[PDB]
Design a protein around this nucleic acid. Structure first.
Lengths: 76, 610, 548
RNA sequence: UUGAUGUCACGGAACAGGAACUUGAACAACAUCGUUAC
């Protein structure tokens, strides 16, 4: 089966690397905190720069489709 | 039409001075939905009608009974007649008996409308239905009684031998009267027979017979029905009937459905697709019962036969079967010669109520619902604890069981059905009718000696799993995101001619895989049939419409924890079509998007002229 | 494969000529007809390449046709379909294609907008389907008759608007000439349409010579009699043309030229008895006889002499036959015209015990031979089956007769009888007993008398003997004590009808007599005045079964 | 609306061939609404 995947796509199997990065399971003693942002910054006791401080910053309108394709990128 | 001869002869035959008129009275009951063709004009919606009385009563005509008696008498003696509709009377053995028989008609007083069945035709290349091949047929219910009177006026001491044998066959339950007998139409049974022999040779009995015009009218028949002796006369030379009955039993583990769209459009429940029910008459009112049709079972067995046998290279499913002598065209008949196997309906040995299952279609990009569509179905519930049996029977004839190749073909087909292939029913892609255990009894081990399970013995454990290599750098105090789309390649390898389900090909594989699932994090699979599962007691039930706090439960089938097949199919399909770089197998191509526009941008609001 | 053609026709569609639009409609019709039945080209699951351009073109084609529904699309497509159906191989595919054409275009001919091409090809399909009906009941099936009637009805639908068509009129006349030989009656308007056709001339086929000959014999005209004599030779069916030329030269009193054409026509007759040639031969003989001519004797005797060699040898002792339903008539005509007594008893012996069967039992025998894995009965029965079923379309399109010879059955000579025995052969004529003729004949052979008078022929009536035998037979199976005097009146009828058996110069007093009966004389109750006490009597079913 | 010295039409099974089948995880995060000021 793997040989067939070498006949169509010759050496550009760079959608299998991301798929293996997205199906990864934390093996042990690793607590990756994931969650969704808040709207503003004044309505979460941690102060994590919610959705309206990211639109003018790291997650700008031109860099948004680049930080949403890399498998594990830190939001904040 | 006609052609009588007008230059034949003139004869003079003396027939003695003995005359005896024997009366046989009783009734005959239907054991299967019968059919009597009366296809009239001015109604083209349904293309196979039944014969009804001007006040909508099911009638059994005289000509049909007479033709069936002639056919059975030509079966008893092993010689068919060769009359040609003209000239002097035939002097063989069958017509010499048929010249002295009188029958009557019947009405049955039931007067309920007949039920309409539908039939399609499946393309044996793509698995779906053929184009425009769909036709209906209206049938009469089960359990309808007809009165029965038969007079024989002859010169012998009572009835002959052939008539006694034929009436014994009809009392056994083998009176195949009419209809589409290949799909198991009318099979009647003669009950409460009574017989009486008069004596017209003397002078006083002849005058008492002539005094009342015989006993033909209703008062004469009510007077005669007090001089009849119970029980039929015993035959002298019992030959044998030529239709064997063999019983089938099927059950393994899964839900079951048999589609019916019009009943789904009328029914009070409102689900998208429901199962098939049939009515039976209880004298005046009708009662429903869920069953498996006879056309469907016939088609499944015919397809299981036709996909194995070679027939010199081209398999039997690629032929046309118009004017050919094939193996499938001999057992299952054609439009030039009648069939040899008659199937029947199959009932479920209990009263299983249907349940309701909901499904949804998940978008690939922005994984959510589809355009807000939930579709449901109402199958019959079956589980590994309650296997949902199916009992039935079908008939074959004598000269098929005596042969050696026909039993070979039938054994091969039933062994392929027994092993798990050819699932019965509807949506078999998500496990309906999944497994089987097909047991056939009543044929003296002529067919059920090829349905024995045989297996190999390798004892090799499945090769281990490989160790992964893709790793990620996860730190603390850095909060992540949960989405992460996967950008695909730009080349999709399409093909326009797929394999085809016509036969089992050469270099392909067929079988089954057994798996083992294990959860590593809490799992939720909801049971959406009711919303107030975790609602406390001793309060109000619910008003007509409010917006309360919904509370589901886990999925159960018979108080047993299960996971449906649709869920697993969906997740494995998503990973499989991501690996091979296939298309977005389910997508919402319509519905243009829309964005708010900002106030800061004064370069876009400088050309929105009033 | 059927979806790339739609796009190849859609690429260069000019929407103005009546050839590219016709090709586009043909491709669409062929794709739909491929979908209606389930062939192997249903697995093609592709589509069309350039979506918006192809959508515009297809919508413009389905929109710029509705004002021109003149029947120019479907009529031409089904015309070419039938034209391809005519020139096929073995009859199976021809039958299936004919019934598919009939099923597909039967609906579009029930409106006022009914094309002449559509109705013409539907009537031709009905007429050509009416010829391919295998009989199974010693009689003609009724579906053939009603196919002919439907063809007549549609050709009358066409010819109700016009008067002459020269194409539908010929189909009408073909259907009438086919209804005539199926035991039916002519339609009521046969003379008028035959006169409409005769006033145009120009025969160009083989059927039209028969239509013109029928016309000239109907109205006694000698116009086309010389025109049908200058036709070319070396065609595909020589025998039918020689028969037509003999029938033509008869009407202009050209004797010593009818016999030569008849003899050249007999020698090349087809091997199948279902060919539409033997019936015209017997009709020609019947017409030659009742015109008080003397030419029919030679033709009848030669036709019998060349008809006897059409049997089939499957083993070492038995034979097979075909049953073409006029063999009795031809044999009686050959018996009535032969004068030599030894030749007459050679004629009468060919009608004896044979195996004249029909299709259903030959099918049974073929399945029996395929049951016992035989191989000398799947190439000898196969020839009979596939030969007498291919000669149904014999004059419509057919080619040379695809058959072979039949061999020669060896004849036992009459000189094998001992000097003390006396031979008697019986024959029951039916053609001359249908008129007031004196029924059947007896043929007496004394092999030790003079040679110049070694055979005697006697004639007798046989109607009353048949009635007596039938009365006794009907009283025998319904009684067993009231059938005692019927035997004695039957024996008195035997002594009365043929009184020459009790003579002295014929059947001498004490010589053993060998009886060979024919017809219903096989079942005479001749068990024990009668010759069952003086002469040594013994039966024999036929004279070719005489071993010692 | 029959004609007489001659009606086996109770002399004839509306019969025979066609799988209501195929496709679908009861699933889910970013805003909504328009004008104010010179």
């Amino acid at each position: 089966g793997f040989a067939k995947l070498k006949e169509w796509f010759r050496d550009e199997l760079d959608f299998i690397e991301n798929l293996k990065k997205l199906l990864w399971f934390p093996e042990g003693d690793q607590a990756p905190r994931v969650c969704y942002p808040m709207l503003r910054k004044k309505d979460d006791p941690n102060g994590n720069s919610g959705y309206e401080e990211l639109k003018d910053g790291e997650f700008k309108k031109e860099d948004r489709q680049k930080k949403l394709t890399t498998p594990w990128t830190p939001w904040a | 039409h006609g052609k009588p001869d007008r230059l034949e002869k003139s004869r003079s035959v003396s027939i003695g001075s003995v005359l005896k008129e024997t009366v046989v009275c009783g009734e005959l009951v239907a054991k299967t939905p019968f059919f009597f063709g009366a296809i009239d004009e001015d109604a083209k919606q349904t293309d196979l009608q039944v014969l009804l009385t001007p006040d909508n009563k099911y009638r059994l005509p005289r000509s049909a009974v007479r033709g069936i008696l002639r056919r059975d008498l030509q079966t008893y003696f092993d010689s068919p007649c060769n009359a040609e509709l003209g000239g002097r009377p035939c002097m063989c053995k069958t017509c010499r008996i048929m010249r002295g028989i009188t029958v009557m008609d019947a009405r049955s007083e039931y007067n309920a409308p007949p039920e309409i069945r539908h039939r399609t035709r499946i393309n044996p290349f793509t698995g779906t239905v053929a184009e425009g091949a769909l036709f209906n047929m209206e049938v009469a219910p089960e359990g309808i009684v007809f009165p029965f009177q038969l007079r024989y006026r002859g010169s012998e001491d009572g009835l002959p031998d052939a008539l006694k044998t034929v009436l014994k066959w009809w009392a056994e339950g083998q009176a195949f009267m009419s209809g589409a007998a290949s799909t198991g139409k009318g099979r009647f049974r003669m009950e409460n027979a009574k017989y009486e022999t008069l004596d017209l040779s003397d002078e006083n009995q002849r005058n008492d017979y002539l005094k009342n015009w015989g006993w033909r009218d209703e008062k004469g028949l009510e007077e005669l029905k007090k001089r009849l002796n119970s029980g039929l006369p015993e035959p002298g030379n019992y030959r044998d009937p030529k239709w064997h009955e063999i019983n089938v039993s099927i059950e393994m583990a899964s839900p079951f459905i048999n589609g019916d769209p019009i009943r789904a459009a009328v029914d009070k429940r409102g689900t998208d697709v429901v199962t098939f029910v049939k009515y039976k008459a209880e004298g005046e009112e009708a009662k429903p019962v869920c069953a498996y049709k006879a056309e469907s079972f016939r088609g499944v067995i015919r397809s299981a036969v036709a996909r194995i046998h070679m027939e010199d290279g081209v398999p039997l499913t690629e032929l046309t079967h118009s004017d050919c002598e094939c193996l499938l065209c001999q057992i299952f008949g054609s439009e030039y010669e009648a069939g040899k196997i008659r199937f029947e309906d199959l009932v479920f040995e209990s009263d299983p109520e249907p349940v309701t299952f909901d499904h949804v279609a998940i978008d690939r990009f922005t994984g959510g619902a589809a355009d807000k569509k939930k579709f449901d179905d109402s199958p019959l519930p079956g589980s590994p604890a309650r296997p949902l049996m199916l009992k039935g029977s079908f008939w074959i004839r004598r000269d098929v069981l005596e042969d050696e190749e026909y039993c070979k073909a039938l054994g091969k087909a039933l062994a392929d059905v027994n092993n798990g292939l050819y699932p019965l029913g509807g949506k078999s892609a998500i496990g309906y009718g999944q497994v089987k255990s097909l047991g056939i009894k009543g044929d003296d081990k002529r067919i059920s000696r090829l349905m024995n399970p045989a297996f190999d013995e390798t004892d090799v454990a499945v090769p281990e799993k490989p160790k992964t290599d893709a790793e990620v750098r996860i730190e603390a105090e850095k909060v992540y995101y949960p989405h992460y789309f996967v950008e695909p390649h730009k080349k999709v390898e399409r093909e326009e001619k797929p394999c085809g389900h016509q036969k089992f090909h050469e270099g392909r594989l067929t079988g089954k895989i057994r798996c083992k699932l294990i959860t590593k994090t809490p799992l939720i699979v909801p049971d959406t049939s009711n919303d107030d599962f975790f609602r406390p007691a001793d309060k109000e039930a619910r008003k007509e419409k409010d917006e309360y706090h919904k509370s589901y439960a886990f999925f159960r089938l018979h108080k047993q924890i299960m996971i449906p097949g649709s869920e697993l199919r969906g997740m494995v399909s998503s990973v499989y079509e991501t690996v091979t770089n296939s298309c977005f197998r389910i997508f919402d191509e319509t519905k243009r998007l829309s964005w708010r526009m900002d106030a800061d941008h004064q370069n876009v609001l400088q050309d929105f002229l009033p | 494969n059927p979806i790339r053609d739609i796009q190849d026709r859609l690429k260069t569609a000019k929407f103005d000529n009546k050839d590219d639009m016709m090709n586009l409609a043909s491709s669409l019709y062929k794709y739909e007809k491929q979908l209606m039945d389930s062939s192997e080209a249903t697995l093609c699951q592709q589509g069309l390449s350039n979506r918006p351009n192809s959508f515009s073109q297809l919508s413009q084609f389905r929109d710029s046709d509705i004002q021109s529904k003149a029947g120019g699309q479907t009529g031409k497509f089904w015309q070419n379909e039938y034209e391809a159906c005519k020139n096929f191989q073995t009859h199976k595919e021809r039958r299936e294609t004919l019934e598919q054409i009939i099923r597909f275009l039967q609906n579009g001919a029930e409106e006022k907008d009914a094309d002449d091409l559509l109705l013409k090809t539907l009537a031709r399909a009905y007429f050509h389907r009416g010829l391919l009906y295998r009989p199974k009941g010693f009689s003609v099936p009724a579906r053939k008759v009603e196919a002919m009637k439907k063809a007549i009805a549609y050709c009358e639908i066409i010819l109700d608007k016009n008067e002459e068509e020269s194409e539908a009129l010929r189909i009408w006349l073909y259907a009438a000439m086919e209804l005539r030989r199926c035991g039916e009656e002519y339609p009521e308007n046969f003379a008028e349409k035959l006169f409409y056709l005769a006033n145009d001339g120009f025969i160009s086929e083989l059927y039209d010579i028969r239509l013109f000959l029928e016309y000239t014999e109907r109205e006694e005209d000698n116009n086309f009699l010389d025109m049908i004599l200058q036709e070319n030779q070396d065609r595909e069916r020589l025998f039918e043309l020689c028969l037509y030329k003999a029938r033509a030269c008869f009407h202009l009193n050209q004797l010593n030229d009818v016999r030569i054409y008849g003899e050249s026509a007999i020698d090349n007759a087809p091997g199948a008895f279902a060919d539409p040639f033997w019936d015209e031969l017997v009709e020609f003989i019947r017409m030659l006889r009742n015109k008080k001519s003397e030419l029919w004797k030679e033709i009848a005797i030669k036709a019998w002499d060349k008809c006897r060699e059409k049997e089939m040898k499957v083993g070492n002792n038995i034979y097979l036959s075909w049953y073409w339903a006029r063999q009795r008539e031809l044999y009686d005509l050959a018996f009535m015209a032969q004068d030599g007594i030894e030749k007459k008893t050679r004629i009468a012996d060919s009608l004896k015990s044979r195996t004249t069967l029909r299709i259903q039992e030959l099918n049974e025998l073929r399945k029996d031979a395929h049951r016992k894995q035989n191989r000398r009965l799947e190439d000898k029965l196969d020839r009979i089956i596939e030969q007498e079923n291919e000669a149904r379309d014999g004059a419509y399109l057919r080619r040379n007769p695809p058959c072979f010879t039949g061999g020669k059955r060896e004849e036992i000579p009459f000189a094998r009888l001992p000097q003390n025995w006396i031979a008697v052969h019986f024959y029951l004529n039916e053609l001359e007993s249908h008129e007031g003729g004196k029924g059947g004949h007896a043929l007496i052979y004394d092999p030790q008398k003079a040679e110049k008078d070694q055979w005697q022929d006697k004639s007798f009536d046989y109607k009353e003997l048949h009635r007596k035998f039938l009365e006794w037979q009907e009283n025998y199976i319904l009684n067993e004590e009231g059938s005692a005097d019927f035997l004695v009146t039957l024996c008195r009828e035997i002594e009365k009808a043929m009184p020459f058996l009790f003579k002295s110069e014929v059947i001498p007093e004490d010589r053993p007599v060998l009886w060979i009966p024919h017809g219903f004389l096989h079942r005479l109750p001749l068990h024990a005045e009668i010759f069952w006490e003086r002469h040594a009597s013994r039966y024999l079913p036929a004279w070719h079964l005489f071993d010692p």
